[PDB]
Chains A and B, each alone.
With several copies, the nearest count.
Chain A
Amino acid sequence: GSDLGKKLLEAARAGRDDEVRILMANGADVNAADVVGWTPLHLAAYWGHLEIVEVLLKNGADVNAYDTLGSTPLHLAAHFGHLEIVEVLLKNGADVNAKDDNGITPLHLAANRGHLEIVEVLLKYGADVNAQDKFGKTAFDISINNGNEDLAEILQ
């Protein structure tokens, strides 16, 4: 928990591109985290800040870093419908089949909120469509329960 590391977390969250650029030059800790275990990349992915995700990855940010409940930035990017960030993370070697503590993959989260374009991107980068969570429910089981005709057709 460094001085610059705490400022990078707040900067990445707010989306101040100019401040993040300055903190990367001063050597702010990219692997710094809060109490729940969220990196600047987690926060940047959550609030949908495309530039800061790109800047952090170039400065050796952990793409497959996970919080205290095992959620990676790809989960947050896929769940909250950030198509651009999901592509950038997967290009920089993001684990597409990353399981959290509950066995919920990014495909499950993208399926639940009905983000059709993100499901196609995840499936392209090799998302396990038959991947089950702790309750034994696939991305298809989520689509039929939510009543999504378009999503159910794609997950064939």
Chain B
Amino acid sequence: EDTPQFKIDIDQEKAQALGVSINDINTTLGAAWGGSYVNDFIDRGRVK
């Protein structure tokens, strides 16, 4: 069935006035709430 969607809206001009890049804003929001795959590591001789 149709689910509720939480539409956040980033103000880029207001962000540029305060002096923050949207790449940092998008990565911060994306990494925090959704998670972010950074790179691989070796857990007991297996890539994870």
* B1-40 interface with A by 8 A CB criterion: 4, 11, 13-14
Q: How many residues of B contact A (CB 8 A)?
A: 4
Contact A135 B13 (CB under 8 A): yes
Main secondary structure of the interface of A (DSSP, over half): loop
Smallest Cβ distance from A65 to chain B, in angstroms? 16
Residue A36, interface by CB 8 Å: yes
Interface string of A22-47 (1 = CB under 8 A from B): 00000000000011101000000000
Contact B11 A34 (CB under 8 A): no
Contact B4 A34 (CB under 8 A): yes
- Inter-chain contacts of B13 with A (CB < 8 A): 135
- Inter-chain contacts of A34 with B (CB < 8 A): 4
Contact A135 B4 (CB under 8 A): no
Q: Which of B4, B11, B14 contacts A38 (CB 8 A)?
A: B4
Smallest Cβ distance from B4 to chain A, in angstroms? 4
7 cross-chain CB contacts under 8 A:
A34-B4, A35-B4, A36-B4, A38-B4, A135-B11, A135-B13, A135-B14
Instruction: Please give me the 4 A-B residue pairs with the lowest Cβ-Cβ distance, nearest first.
Output: A36-B4, A135-B11, A135-B14, A34-B4
Residues of A within 8 A of B (CB): 34-36, 38, 135
